[PDB]
Design a protein around this ligand. Structure first.
Ligand SMILES: *[C@@H]1O[C@H](CO)[C@@H](O[C@@H]2O[C@H](CO)[C@@H](O)[C@H](O)[C@H]2NC(C)=O)[C@H](O)[C@H]1NC(C)=O
Ligand SMILES: *[C@@H]1O[C@H](CO)[C@@H](O[C@H]2O[C@H](CO)[C@@H](O)[C@H](O)[C@H]2NC(C)=O)[C@H](O)[C@H]1NC(C)=O
Ligand SMILES: *[C@H]1O[C@H](CO)[C@@H](O)[C@H](O)[C@H]1NC(C)=O
Length: 282
């Protein structure tokens, strides 16, 4: 059985290229030796157990039409290092054990799949994961401990969702994280301890959200921070600004503008142009 129907196969490494055939299902008779499987740009609707072989290292399923990944689909892909399920606009939800088995996975792409929520334990056990792309879904909340096992995660992209709050332990377990992108949500509130333990984080984007203030304790929990983007938020330059203002007095970081939206008498000024005297009556 040497190459799946309408695909092209290569031997070093063992690769099966099945891109752009308008397939409705994953082709049959995948050689067990296959390490790279390229199924992007098809119209595949469902995935089931018994479809993928155990030697896969790379599996690209982006730009398909997936709506259901049945239980057990990925369970025996112990070796898998990269899984891209991005751009499946009707996917919508994932069952809680979808990634069980994938303890060697290093990159997981879930961008643009209409996810509105995730199971709280969906990323459990993904101890190898270094890159997780969840941008441009419709996510409304993230639970505490949603990433708690992801000790090696370096990039977490959550921009372009519908998040309103970051809770106390939403980022617990992310001790290796280097970049956290949360721009283009609707964030209104960040818990004072939401960034606790993010000791290696160097880049934080929070621009284009609905933040009127941010707690001073939270920036202080980012000792490694190098670049912060805070622009396109309705910053309140009243007594609420004092902790962020104070942090910026000491901070050595690159930053965007932090433009006051309110009160009218400070609208348009940068929050760093305020002086100690402006906060004396707080
Ligand atoms: C892409 O997947 C979507 C969602 O499963 C399909 O839209 C469903 O299509 C059937 C028509 O056969 C309807 O019963 C459902 O109302 C549709 N659901 C939604 C949410 O639109 C669509 O047919 C699929 N297209 C291809 C080419 O695979
Ligand atoms: C601010 O962020 C939002 C994402 O919430 C951006 O908005 C919308 O953004 C685009 C249209 O301008 C489209 O790509 C989307 O279909 C639409 N999405 C949502 C969820 O509303 C908006 O562009 C961002 N603004 C800037 C200047 O970056
Ligand atoms: C798949 O490929 C064609 C031709 O390039 C594309 O335009 C078409 O819409 C796709 N097929 C189906 C069945 O929709």
């Amino acid at each position: 059985p040497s190459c799946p129907m309408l695909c092209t196969c290569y031997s070093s490494p063992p690769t099966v290229s099945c891109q752009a055939n308008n397939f409705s299902s994953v082709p049959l008779s995948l050689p067990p030796s296959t390490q790279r499987l390229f199924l992007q740009n098809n119209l595949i609707r469902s995935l089931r157990p018994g479809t993928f072989g155990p030697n896969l290292l790379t599996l690209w399923l982006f730009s398909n039409n997936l709506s259901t990944i049945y239980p057990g689909t990925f369970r025996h892909l112990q070796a898998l290092e990269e899984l891209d399920l991005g751009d499946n606009r009707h996917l919508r939800s994932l069952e809680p054990d979808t990634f069980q088995g994938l303890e060697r996975l290093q990159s997981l792409h879930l961008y643009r799949c209409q996810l509105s929520s995730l199971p709280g334990n969906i990323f459990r056990g993904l101890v190898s994961l270094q890159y997780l792309y969840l941008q441009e879904n419709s996510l409304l909340h993230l639970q505490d401990d949603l990433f708690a096992d992801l000790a090696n995660l370096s990039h977490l992209f959550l921009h372009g969702n519908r998040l309103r709050l970051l809770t106390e332990h939403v980022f617990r377990g992310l001790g290796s994280l280097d970049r956290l992108l949360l721009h283009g949500n609707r964030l209104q509130g960040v818990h004072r301890a939401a960034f606790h333990g993010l000791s290696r984080l160097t880049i934080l984007y929070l621009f284009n959200n609905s933040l009127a203030s941010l707690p001073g304790e939270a920036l202080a929990d980012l000792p490694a921070l190098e670049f912060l983007r805070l622009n396109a938020n309705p910053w309140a330059c009243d007594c609420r600004a004092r902790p962020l203002w104070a942090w910026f007095q000491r901070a050595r970081v690159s930053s965007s503008d932090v433009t006051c939206a309110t009160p009218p008498e400070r609208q348009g000024r940068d929050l760093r142009t305020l002086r100690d005297t402006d906060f004396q009556a707080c």
